[PDB]
């Protein structure tokens, strides 16, 4: 697959 | 006019081949901060084998706001891998600023494929060490 995916996420939902 | 506080951190993960084979391992750096007396403490966190089955082929890399007395801090961030010559490899940036609170992280679930990382022709694990660079840009106003 793609070597890197430049899409940001978090390990938790919300704040 | 946005006010920006930039600071950086270099994390060397030694004994990279001794990361666990089982799922679920999280490795974290020491904390770091800007030179400002802002009471912010940050660290980096890696999952060598990803966060879930979708990312099992990847290293997952996030920036964590460990300690913060304020309700939020907005920041842009960038992560890079230094190769055996010291050169920038496979860097990626957030582009926009993300909202951090104490205990919140932001980053890339699919930061780099393990197959690319573990291929010695890419020079990314010299002497079994992974070197990661992070620049953080805190945006205030």
Author numbering:
A (entry chain D): 428 to 442
B (entry chain A): 26 to 166
Q: What text appears in the publication on this structure?
A:
The adaptor protein, speckle-type BTB/POZ protein (SPOP), recruits substrates to the cullin-3-subclass of E3 ligase for selective protein ubiquitylation. SPOP recruits substrates via its N-terminal MATH domain, whereas a central BTB domain mediates dimerization and interactions with Cul3. Here, we show that MyD88 interacts with SPOP through a long degron that contains the established SPOP-binding consensus and an N-terminal site that we name the Q-motif. We determine the structural basis of these interactions and show that the Q-motif interacts with an unexplored binding pocket on the SPOP MATH domain.
We found that the search motif is present in six additional known SPOP substrates – GLI family zinc finger 2 (GLI2), DEK, steroid receptor coactivator-3 (SRC-3; also known as nuclear receptor coactivator 3 (NCoA-3)), sentrin-specific protease 7 (SENP7), SET domain-containing protein 2 (SETD2), and Caprin1. We crystallized SPOPMATH in complex with the 17-mer substrate peptides and obtained high-resolution structures of SPOPMATH in complex with SRC-3, SETD2, and Caprin1. The SRC-3, SETD2, and Caprin1 peptides all interact at the SPOPMATH substrate-binding groove with the same overall backbone conformation as MyD88. The SPOPMATH hydrophobic pocket (SPOP Phe136, Ile137, and Phe141) encompasses the side chains of peptide positions −4 and −5. The SBC regions of the SRC-3, SETD2, and Caprin1 peptides also interact with SPOPMATH as reported in other substrates, with the exception of the SETD2 and SRC-3 residues that deviate from the consensus at the +4 and +5 positions, respectively. The 17-mer peptides of Caprin1, GLI2, and SRC-3 bound with the highest affinity, whereas the DEK peptides had the lowest-affinity interactions, with little difference between the 17-mer and 9-mer peptides. Similar to MyD88, mutation of the Q-motif abolished the interactions, consistent with the finding that the Q-motif is necessary for interaction of SPOP to these proteins.
